[PDB]
Structure formats: structure tokens, C-alpha cells
Specification:
Chain B: Its main location: endoplasmic reticulum. This is part of a larger assembly, with chains A, B, C and D. Chain B contains five helices and no strands. Chain B is mainly α. Chain D is 79% helix and 0% strand. Chain D is built from three helices and no strands. Chain D is flat and about 40 Å long. The chains are: A alpha/beta, B mainly alpha, C alpha/beta, D mainly alpha. Chains A and C meet through helix 3, helix 4, helix 6, helix 7 and helix 12 of A and helix 3, helix 5, helix 6, helix 7 and helix 10 of C. Bound molecules: the ligand CCCCCCCC/C=C\CCCCCCCC(=O)O[C@@H](COC(=O)CCCCCCCCCCCCCCC)COP(=O)([O-])OCC[N+](C)(C)C.
């Protein structure tokens, strides 16, 4: 070997460079695993034209079946409120999410009319370009003070609120643990972001613990990647699809033990739970600072269009520049904002309406128990719950038809009920068909018991 | 401002090198660096040229092959969160006029600095190491690979 | 396709020296931003920002610092040109609350004084329907008194009203299509109806400058998205041919559907879509057409029916015609118009139809009154004077600015005038100088646009009198002399 | 008159070099570096390069 080294050293430089490049060439041939065939063919103009001519597209919309229950919309001849007229029949409203009866107060209408006189209807632009009014800032300050939180942000549409809040913080590569029974807005927000989604059983902290333990096991394998991966837990204060509350304290413990932030959705529970009606945090006594982001809409309780998100400035300031429903859309009309402000004033003046609503919900939930063919799904504290078929048929269409039969027969009996509506092909976890019962402080005890008796009679007559 | 206000493209960072007058600005920046290097009184010409080569190559490496991501919020949910600028360029198309220009210009600078350094061996090895450090990442095969897991995350 | 009238547009190229100086400015800003980031990291200079709570210091950082680079170093310096509050109706003249900052726009303090009578060139009221006194205001007040504000349910649920049916039938009459549907948000219309029409296995051909709502709606659906150059019929035809011929990418199969998303008027560019060519191409290649008509439904057309009337085409040729009431009619909302089968499928299978609260009664009443006034149901001479005045104002303003030596984008008919600034500092300089002279404008910078063109958008209106336009033009001339914004080589 | 022209030229310099949006100390840093580079370049040009350009300037002055 030494003699070979000396002989190689005896060689000129160009000769050795040539030998080296030849050896590199040999390596390239040896590792040229691609077996090219040396061919090239292209299509002909007539071939392209005939290929274009063969193609025939599908219709834009599929042919419609005439049996669609959703093809028929109930028509309300007037404002949806207590003693409404549905399909020309005078009824009592048990279907509209108007918990505090703030839709038809004279004060709310007066404030809305004053703002309409001052400003008009439209805002004519986004918040960036001369679409910010003083009413918007006033309402944001009022919401922040009401929720005992640093900052709040307003969207002009309930769906877009959470559907734009979620993708702003969760990006591609992060992990989101979301409850199985989550509203469609949360699902669309999670789809808009490209993060990894891990569903867990409804209100089951055992499954959440198992998933978090699996995630920690995966973190132990590649710590470098685990140091740049964020974890979120998206839950609802009061679920719409089931009517059940969520266990906050266990979620807070799991957050602080596994380093995973919490996003709370509080559309149903914003103005109905707690002594002062600030959500489920007052119901459980949890500190507001433990929850990173709280999202609600101003439609169910405040009886006006819009939505909002509340939190610390550190998290809220990001949405003013990353929320798509905020940056690329017109701001909320001033009269709706004034109505929301007046509703907040009314809620702050007297907090006994929440107790009244709680007691009415207790009465109606206790009275409704005992139907032969129907079962109540939901908690006693929920203002809106469900009635479901105890024994169901093989297919869903017959269940829907039976529920609509019950609804129509009740509506002929001066009780206006509604049936829960879903997108069958789109929902991640499709809930069973059910009849939705909604409670309002306007409803009297006699009306509630009359509704319970009528529902019992109609259900036992129809299911039998 | 916000991405998507006046253009639907998710990642504008992939077009900054295809704009108008960018190549002329790059060449003028190199020339201005050379002028301010000549301005130093006590430094000889070959040292000035090798400093020009080294500084330009170091800055080019730092900007193209070290900084990864985008300087602004992007609506594709951070698809290019880990890619460097050279990988983001032209959405991964490996050959393009901009890429050809950026690969060719350090070689021309190397030729000029070799001519002006009178082919000294020390300057040869310095400039060759720098040229290799710049030209190796430009290879199409060396796309999306971090050696020894450095600058991976 | 053929045009009955000449189709004039101009997009002048950037002077080379201007591009070089733009790059010089951006490089200086980037270097100083890196220096400021280095100073802030080592706590040499105290950071004026909010931080994570002490109990969550061991969590993974919520944001990535580099993504906020341009926000910390470029946006924050000229932050006072945006989010300007107003305390008056957004008419031809608006009142702006005055604010000042002492820490270089990191925080704003509100002074008591109020700027009054600022000429409004930023609001979207094309036909001047944003008024606090009128017939529409009285109708909205009556409907607010009767129905209240806001509905508390969904359309498929008890939340469907008679006002909504009246609005839908009136909109269908106004457009000329068989049927139409109305929603409570223009963004939501696209984002919630595009996923319904197409899905996995279909192709979406999207223009280069589509709105964020159209892009989000296309992303939410599982379809494949391909982008063609802005108003480039050659690129559209090439994409259509390749899509039909070569099939799906991995497993070569015929496409289930092909949908073309286009807009009537592109706001930032200022151009009008070549509708006859697009219609001819879609007829030849058997594609479907989605037409976003937010900026042209009231501005364009002899009677203000939109782009299809502007080109004198047949509304039955466009498969889906979407539109927004915010721009022209002065009230929030949106609509989709088309054939009856499409509208029924949308009423059954739309996200906003099932899960979202419907419109507000005062808003629908204001829309109804405004659109009746536009189509002349009231019998008053108004509704034609607005369109004629808008056309005259657009023509006069565009001609006067083009003969002053400025660079302007778009057609001669579009009521949106993008003036060109081309440099990062001139953005803030123009905004501040124009506000100092009582003109309100909108300025758009780098990350929104391409790097070399940064612009200022003027939105004309039918409520702008001739004296207002003359005052604005003389102030614009003075500022253009001050900042040297007259880059045009053709005429000056 | 001439002072107004010089102030206008300084304003244009600020606009072109993007110094308009920077804070005063950043302007100070940039200006100091610029004047240092110009002075060093003039010193080098005088010491090493022949004063042929100086002769041209003198001829133009005369
Ligand atoms: C990867 C980082 C790339 C940094 C490139 C630096 C280029 C800017 C530069 O050289 O001059 C800057 C220093 O620049 C600094 O001193 C900043 C050094 C990096 C700071 C990183 C902070 C991380 C938090 C200063 O430039 P100037 O003299 O103000 O002009």
C-alpha cells in the first residue's frame, strides 16, 4: 500500500485529476438507477380535439327528491317572539333562541332607533378602511368590562367568529383535541386550519387523558419537533347538539399538567349560566385568566347580529390582523351594536332574570319527564334541550317523519316547536334526529305545563 | 398590510426575485460593496477582491440558505414554515431564469477575483471554499435535506 | 366573444430608477428591522408589548416571532393611516376622531377635537345611499319598530320570515334570473356556498386576483385549484385545454366538473373582467361560471344591473351570480342568483341556511327600498341621476388625473382609481399629507401587493359634487408636486 | 429661497432612502455611517488617485 501511495504521488496533477473525475463518473453510472428508455411522443391536434369532444361534465346540482323535509320552510308572519304566527297559525314560541326576551324590549328598540337616526344602516367598508365607528369601540369596551377581561373583538357574524378565530392560532403541524359533539362552526374552523385533529368522547376526561398521554409518548421520541408543536383543547360551555355542560376544572388541571391551551365556545351559556350570567366560568367558579380565549355570538342572548371573542390583549391583538372574517369583511351596522350595548346595560342592571330562567328550565325539564316513546336529552340547567325517540326504526327518514308528525300536531295545538337540522353528509358525528325545546323567561309556568301536557298527549298518541 | 388584499397568491415570498429591476439592484449592491471596500486606504487590491467575494458569498448564504420561513403571516397555514428562501423560490421549480442568474453570478465573481488575485494559492483555497459553500446548496439533489440535523427546526 | 363598445385599459410599467429606489428603501428597512430585533432580544431596549402570563412560561410559544417581522418593523411605523374611527354617516363628507401617539404608533391617545368635513374617498357608497335622512331610513325605522332588530333562529328553523321571501323575489326580478337567495354576510356567501357546489374530484379555475372569500371557499371544498393570469384569456384557454385533455393528476380520469371563479370589477387593480371571452370559452369547453359581482352590481350598467348589462349580455348565460349589498345599496348582506333548481339545492344544502342566523329586518327593508328606488318603482326621477352622475364623475376624475402626469390602473369606466406611489415611505407620507388637507384615502403596501407597486385607492361616488372633485384634484396636484408622484412618461 | 430648496432636497432624500419612517437615532446612525464612508472615499481618492478630477472641477469653476 505504501509503495502504491508513492507510485501515485509520482504521478502528475492533471493525470490524477482525470483519474478522479473518471472514478466519479464510474460512481455515477453505478448509482444511475434510472433506466431511461429514450423515447418521446406527443399528442396530435385532432387527437386533442376529439378528446375534448368526448368529455361530458356532470350537472352543477344533482336531481332533487321531492320528499325533502327541509324543502319546506316555515313562514313567520311577523316578528319571531312570544305569541307568534307560524304558517298562518297563532302559536306560542318554543323554538327561537331568545332566552332573556330582549328582542322586543322598548329600550333596545329605542337605542337601535337612535343609532339608526345618527348613523344609518350600512358601514360601507372594513374596519381597516373607515369602517370603524365609535359604537364599535364602545361595544368592545363594554364586553371587555362585562366579562372581566382585558380585551374583546367583534365580528359581524356568529359563524365567522369562531370559524376565523380557530385558524388564526392553530397552523399546520399543531395538535388539536376537540370534543366529539362540537358544533358545525367549530368543525369548519378546524378544517380551515390544517392542524391535526384528535376527537375524544363527549365529556370524557378518560379519553382526553389517554390522548394526552399518547401525545407525550410521541413527544419523547423527537423532542426537537416537540419543542415547536403547540397543543389546543377546544370545548363548549354548553353543547348545542346534546345540551350538556362541560367539566371545566378537570380540563384546567389537564391543561396545566400537559401544557395545552384551552379554547372555550360559549354561544349557549353566555347569558344564561352564572349568577351574573358571564358564562360557565361563574357556574364553576373558575378564574377567567385560566381560559385563553372565550368565543360567543351576540344572537342567542343579546338578540342582535354579530359575535365576539374575549381574552387577554396578547391573544386578542393577533386576530385584528390574522382573522379573515375581520380583515376582509364589512363591520357590523351601528344600530345592531347599539342594540347589543343596550342589552348589556339591561343584563347588568338586574341579574335576577338568570335565576328566573334557571327555575323555568328546572320546571319544564322535570315536567317533561315521563313520555312513553320520547326521552329527554340534556341537563336541567340548559335553556335548550332535546327530545329523542327511545326505540328508533332502522332508517333515519322514518324517524324524521315521526318527529315532524309530532311537531305538526303540536303546532295545530298552539305550541310552536322545531326540529334540529343538520347536514348529513358534512357532519363529523351526526346526532340522532330530535325535537328541540327552548325555554324563555317570557313563558309563564302555565304555558310551560300546558306545553308539557300537549307534547305528552301528542307523542303518546303518535308513537303508539 | 394583510396578504391577499390585492393579490390572491398565498406566498408572495416566491415572487420577489422575479420582479422588475431586482437583478439590476443586486448587481448595483455588489458594485457598491466593491466601491466601499476599495475606499479603505491600507488594503491591497487582491485582499479587497477576496473580501468582496467572501462577504457577498456569506451574505448570500445567510439570506438564501439559512433564514427559513416568511417574514409575514401567510394564509396557507405555514406550509413554508421550515423551508428556506431558496426552497420557497418559484414553488420548488428547480430551474428558472432567477435561479440560473443566482447560481451563475458567484461563479463570475470567482473568476474576476481569481484574475485579480494573480492566482495565489491561499486566495485560491479561500475563494474555492467560499464558492463551494455557496454552490453546494444550489444543487437540485440537495433540496430539503439538513446535514446532521442542523437548522432542521 | 365580441365587444359592442371599445374596451380600453392601461397598466403602465414601472420606471427602472423608481424600482431601484424602492429596493433601496426596502433593504434599509429590513436591515434596521434586524437591528431593532437584535436590540429587543437582549433587553437593551425595553419592549413595549404584551407578553405571556407568568404561569405559562413553560408552554410552547403561541406565535412565531419571524412571522411578525413586517408587523413590528414596517406596519407599526405607518400604522396611523389605518383604522381611523369616524363619528358620522359615511357620506361624501365624514367626521374623523383625532388621535395622537407618543411612542411611535405603539399606542394611541384620543384628543377631544374632531376633524370635520373630510372629503371621503375611502368608503364604498358608489350610488350615495349612505344617508341618515331619506325614504329608506324611514322604512327601516318602521320595520325596526315592528319586527325588532335581529332574528334569533335559522332559516330552516323558525327563523324564516316574510321579509326574506319578499327580498328574494325582488332580487330575482332585479337581476333577471329565475330565483335568488339572500344571506347575512358577503364573505359568508362565498365561504359557505362554494363548498356546496363542488367537492373532491372537481376542478376550480381561479383568477390571479380573487378576493379572500373566494379563495377560502375554494379551499374549504376538496376541489383542485389552478390559477390563471389576471384577465389573460390565453392562460385560461391553455388551462382549460390541459385540464380536459390530461385529466386528474395522479389517476388520470375525466374531471367531474370545471368551475371558473371570476369577479366583475377587481377593486385593487381597477379592471373589468373580459366577460364575452370568458363566456365563449366556457361555452366551447363546457365549464360552469361563478361571477362575483360585489363591486359592479350598482356601479356598472346603464340601469345599474352589473357587468352583464354593461357588456349587453344574457344573464341566463352565467351559472351562478353572487353579489353583495354592502358596496352600492348601503346595507350589509349578500345574495346568490341563478336558476330555480340551483336555488332549491342551495336552500337545502347550504351551511348558512342550516347553521347560521338569517338577515335582520331593518337591513332587508333598507335593501328593498334602495333597490326599488334604483329600478324606478317609486316613480321618482332619482335612481337614474345617481348612475349618470357616477359615470360622469368617474370619467372626469380619471381624465383629470391622467392628464396631470400620474400613473393610473384599470379601465376608463371603473369607478375605482388606483394611484401609484411605488415606495414604502411615500405610502405613509401620502396618507398623512392628504389627511392634513382634509381628504381621506386608502393606502396599500407591500405584503398585500407585489413588491414594486404600492398604491392608493380612490373610490368615487354619485354623491361627490363637481366642486368636491375639483378641490380634491387641486390638493392631489399639490401633494404630487410635493412628493414627486408624477411618474407617467406618456403625458404630464 | 435657497434654504427652502435645500430643505426640499433633504425631504426627497428622506423619502427615497426610507429614513422618513425611522426614529431620530436611526437617522443619526445612517447619516453618520454615510458621511464617514464619503469622507473616507474622498481621502483615499486624494491620497492615491491623481487629482485629474480636481483639475476638471477647477476648470469648471473657472
Ligand atoms: C439569522 C439572522 C440573520 C441576521 C442578518 C443580519 C443582517 C443585518 C446586519 O448585518 O446589520 C445589522 C446587524 O444585525 C444584527 O446585529 C442582528 C443579528 C441577528 C439578530 C437575531 C435576533 C434573533 C431574535 C445592523 O445594520 P445597521 O448597521 O443598522 O444598517
Amino acid at each position: 500500500l505504501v509503495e502504491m501511495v508513492q507510485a501515485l504521488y509520482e504521478a502528475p496533477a492533471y493525470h490524477l485529476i482525470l483519474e478522479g473525475i473518471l472514478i466519479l463518473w464510474i460512481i455515477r453510472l453505478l448509482f444511475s438507477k434510472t433506466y431511461k428508455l429514450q423515447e418521446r411522443s406527443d399528442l396530435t391536434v385532432k387527437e386533442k380535439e376529439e378528446l375534448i369532444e368526448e368529455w361530458q361534465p356532470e350537472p352543477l346540482v344533482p336531481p332533487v327528491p321531492k320528499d325533502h323535509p327541509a324543502l319546506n320552510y316555515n313562514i313567520v308572519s311577523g316578528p319571531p317572539s312570544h305569541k307568534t304566527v307560524v304558517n298562518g297559525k297563532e302559536c306560542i314560541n318554543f323554538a327561537s333562541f331568545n332566552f332573556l326576551g330582549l328582542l322586543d324590549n322598548p329600550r333596545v328598540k329605542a337605542a337601535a332607533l337612535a343609532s339608526l337616526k345618527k348613523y344609518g344602516v350600512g358601514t360601507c367598508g372594513p374596519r381597516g378602511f373607515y369602517g370603524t365607528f365609535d359604537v364599535h369601540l364602545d361595544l368592545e369596551d363594554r364586553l371587555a368590562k362585562f366579562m372581566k377581561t382585558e380585551e374583546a373583538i367583534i365580528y359581524s357574524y356568529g359563524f365567522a367568529t369562531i370559524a376565523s378565530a380557530i385558524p388564526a392560532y392553530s397552523k399546520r403541524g399543531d395538535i388539536v383535541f376537540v370534543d366529539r359533539a362540537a358544533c358545525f362552526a367549530i368543525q369548519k374552523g378546524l378544517q380551515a386550519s390544517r392542524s391535526d385533529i384528535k376527537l375524544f368522547k363527549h365529556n370524557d376526561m378518560a379519553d382526553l387523558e389517554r390522548l394526552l398521554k399518547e401525545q407525550e409518548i410521541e413527544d419523547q421520541k423527537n423532542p426537537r419537533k416537540a419543542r415547536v408543536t403547540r397543543r389546543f383543547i377546544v370545548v363548549e360551555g354548553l353543547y348545542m347538539n346534546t345540551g350538556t355542560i362541560c367539566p371545566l376544572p378537570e380540563l384546567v388541571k389537564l391543561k396545566y399538567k400537559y401544557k395545552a391551551r384551552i379554547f372555550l365556545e360559549e354561544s349557549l351559556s353566555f347569558g344564561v349560566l352564572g349568577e351574573h350570567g358571564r358564562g360557565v366560568t361563574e357556574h364553576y367558579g373558575i378564574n377567567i385568566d385560566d381560559i385563553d380565549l372565550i368565543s360567543a355570538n351576540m344572537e342567542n342572548a343579546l338578540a342582535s347580529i354579530g359575535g365576539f371573542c374575549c381574552g387577554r390583549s396578547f391573544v386578542i391583538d393577533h386576530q385584528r390582523l390574522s382573522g379573515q372574517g375581520y380583515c376582509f369583511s364589512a363591520s357590523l351596522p351601528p344600530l345592531l351594536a347599539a342594540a347589543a350595548i343596550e342589552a348589556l346595560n339591561i343584563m347588568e342592571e338586574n341579574p335576577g332574570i338568570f335565576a328566573v330562567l334557571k327555575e323555568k328550565c328546572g320546571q319544564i325539564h322535570k315536567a317533561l319527564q315521563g313520555i312513553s316513546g320520547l326521552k329527554v336529552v340534556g341537563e336541567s340547567l340548559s335553556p335548550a334541550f332535546h327530545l329523542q325517540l327511545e326505540e328508533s326504526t332502522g332508517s333515519r327518514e322514518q324517524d324524521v317523519r315521526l318527529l315532524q308528525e309530532i311537531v305538526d300536531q303540536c303546532m295545530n295545538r298552539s305550541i310552536a316547536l322545531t326540529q334540529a337540522r343538520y347536514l348529513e353528509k358534512e357532519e363529523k358525528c351526526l346526532p340522532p334526529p330530535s325535537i328541540r325545546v327552548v325555554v324563555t323567561v317570557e313563558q309563564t309556568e302555565e304555558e310551560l305545563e300546558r306545553a308539557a301536557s300537549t307534547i305528552k298527549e301528542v307523542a303518546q298518541a303518535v308513537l303508539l | 398590510m394583510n396578504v391577499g388584499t390585492a393579490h390572491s397568491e398565498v406566498n408572495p415570498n416566491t415572487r420577489v426575485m422575479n420582479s422588475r429591476g431586482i437583478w439590476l439592484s443586486y448587481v448595483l449592491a455588489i458594485g457598491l460593496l466593491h466601491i466601499v471596500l476599495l475606499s479603505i486606504p491600507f488594503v491591497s487590491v487582491p485582499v479587497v477582491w477576496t473580501l468582496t467575494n467572501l462577504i457577498h458569498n456569506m451574505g448570500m448564504y445567510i439570506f438564501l440558505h439559512t433564514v427559513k420561513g416568511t417574514p409575514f403571516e401567510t394564509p396557507d397555514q405555514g406550509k413554508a414554515r421550515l423551508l428556506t428562501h431558496w426552497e420557497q423560490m418559484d414553488y420548488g421549480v428547480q430551474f428558472t431564469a432567477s435561479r440560473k442568474f443566482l447560481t451563475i453570478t458567484p461563479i463570475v465573481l470567482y473568476f474576476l477575483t481569481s484574475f485579480y488575485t494573480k492566482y495565489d494559492q491561499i486566495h485560491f483555497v479561500l475563494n474555492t471554499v467560499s464558492l463551494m459553500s455557496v454552490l453546494i446548496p444550489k444543487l437540485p439533489q440537495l433540496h430539503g435535506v439538513r446535514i446532521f440535523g442542523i437548522n432542521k427546526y | 366573444g365580441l365587444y359592442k363598445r371599445p374596451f380600453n385599459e392601461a397598466f403602465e410599467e414601472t420606471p427602472m430608477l423608481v424600482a431601484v429606489l424602492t429596493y433601496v428603501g426596502y433593504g434599509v428597512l429590513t436591515l434596521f428591522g434586524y437591528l431593532r430585533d437584535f436590540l429587543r432580544y437582549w433587553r437593551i431596549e425595553k419592549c413595549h408589548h404584551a407578553t405571556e402570563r407568568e404561569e405559562q412560561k413553560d408552554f410552547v410559544s403561541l406565535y412565531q416571532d419571524f412571522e411578525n417581522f413586517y408587523t413590528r418593523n414596517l406596519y407599526m411605523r405607518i400604522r396611523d393611516n389605518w383604522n381611523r374611527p369616524i363619528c358620522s354617516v359615511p357620506g361624501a363628507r365624514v367626521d374623523i376622531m383625532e388621535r395622537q401617539s407618543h411612542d411611535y404608533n405603539w399606542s394611541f391617545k384620543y384628543t377631544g377635537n374632531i376633524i370635520k368635513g373630510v372629503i371621503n374617498m375611502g368608503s364604498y357608497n358608489y350610488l350615495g345611499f349612505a344617508r341618515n335622512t331619506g325614504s329608506c331610513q324611514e322604512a327601516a325605522a318602521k320595520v325596526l319598530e315592528e319586527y325588532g332588530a335581529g332574528v334569533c333562529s335559522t332559516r330552516q328553523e323558525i327563523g324564516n320570515l316574510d321579509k326574506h321571501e319578499e327580498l328574494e323575489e325582488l332580487v330575482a326580478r332585479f337581476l333577471g334570473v329565475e330565483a335568488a337567495m339572500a344571506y347575512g354576510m358577503g364573505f359568508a356567501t362565498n365561504s359557505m356556498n362554494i363548498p356546496a357546489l363542488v367537492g373532491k374530484g372537481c376542478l376550480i379555475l381561479s383568477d390571479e386576483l380573487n378576493h379572500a372569500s373566494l379563495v377560502l371557499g375554494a379551499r374549504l371544498s376538496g376541489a383542485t385549484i389552478r390559477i390563471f393570469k389576471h384577465n389573460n384569456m390565453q392562460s385560461l384557454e391553455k388551462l382549460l385545454k390541459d385540464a380536459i385533455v390530461y385529466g386528474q393528476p395522479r389517476t388520470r380520469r375525466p374531471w367531474k366538473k370545471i368551475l371558473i371563479l371570476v369577479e366583475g370589477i377587481y377593486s385593487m387593480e381597477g379592471s373589468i373582467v373580459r366577460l364575452p371571452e370568458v363566456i365563449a370559452l366556457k361555452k366551447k369547453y363546457k365549464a360552469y361560471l361563478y361571477l362575483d359581482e360585489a363591486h359592479s352590481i350598482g356601479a356598472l350598467g346603464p340601469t345599474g344591473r352589473g357587468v352583464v348589462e354593461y357588456f349587453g349580455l344574457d344573464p341566463e348565460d352565467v351559472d351562478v351570480m353572487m353579489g353583495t349589498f354592502t358596496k352600492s345599496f348601503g346595507a350589509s348582506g349578500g345574495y346568490i342568483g341563478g336558476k330555480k333548481e340551483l336555488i332549491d339545492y342551495l336552500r337545502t344544502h347550504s351551511h348558512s341556511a342550516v347553521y347560521a342566523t338569517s338577515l335582520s329586518p331593518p337591513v332587508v327593508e333598507q335593501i328593498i327600498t334602495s333597490m326599488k328606488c334604483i329600478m324606478g318603482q317609486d316613480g321618482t326621477s332619482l335612481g337614474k341621476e345617481c348612475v349618470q352622475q357616477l359615470a360622469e364623475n368617474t370619467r372626469y376624475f380619471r381624465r383629470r388625473l391622467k392628464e396631470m402626469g400620474f400613473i393610473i390602473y384599470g379601465n376608463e369606466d371603473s369607478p375605482v382609481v388606483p394611484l401609484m406611489l411605488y415606495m414604502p415611505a411615500k405610502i405613509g407620507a401620502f396618507g398623512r399629507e392628504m389627511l392634513k388637507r382634509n381628504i381621506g384615502v386608502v393606502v396599500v403596501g407591500f405584503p398585500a401587493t407585489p413588491i414594486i407597486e404600492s398604491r392608493a385607492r380612490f373610490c368615487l361616488s354619485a354623491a361627490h359634487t363637481k366642486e368636491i372633485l375639483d378641490t380634491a384634484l387641486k390638493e392631489i396636484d399639490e401633494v404630487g408636486d410635493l412628493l414627486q408622484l408624477k411618474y407617467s412618461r406618456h403625458r404630464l | 429661497r435657497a434654504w427652502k430648496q435645500m430643505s426640499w432636497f433633504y425631504y426627497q432624500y428622506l423619502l427615497v432612502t426610507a429614513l422618513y419612517m425611522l426614529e431620530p437615532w436611526e437617522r443619526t446612525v445612517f447619516n453618520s455611517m454615510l458621511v464617514s464612508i464619503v469622507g473616507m472615499a474622498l481621502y483615499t481618492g486624494y491620497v492615491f488617485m491623481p487629482q485629474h478630477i480636481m483639475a476638471i472641477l477647477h476648470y469648471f469653476e473657472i
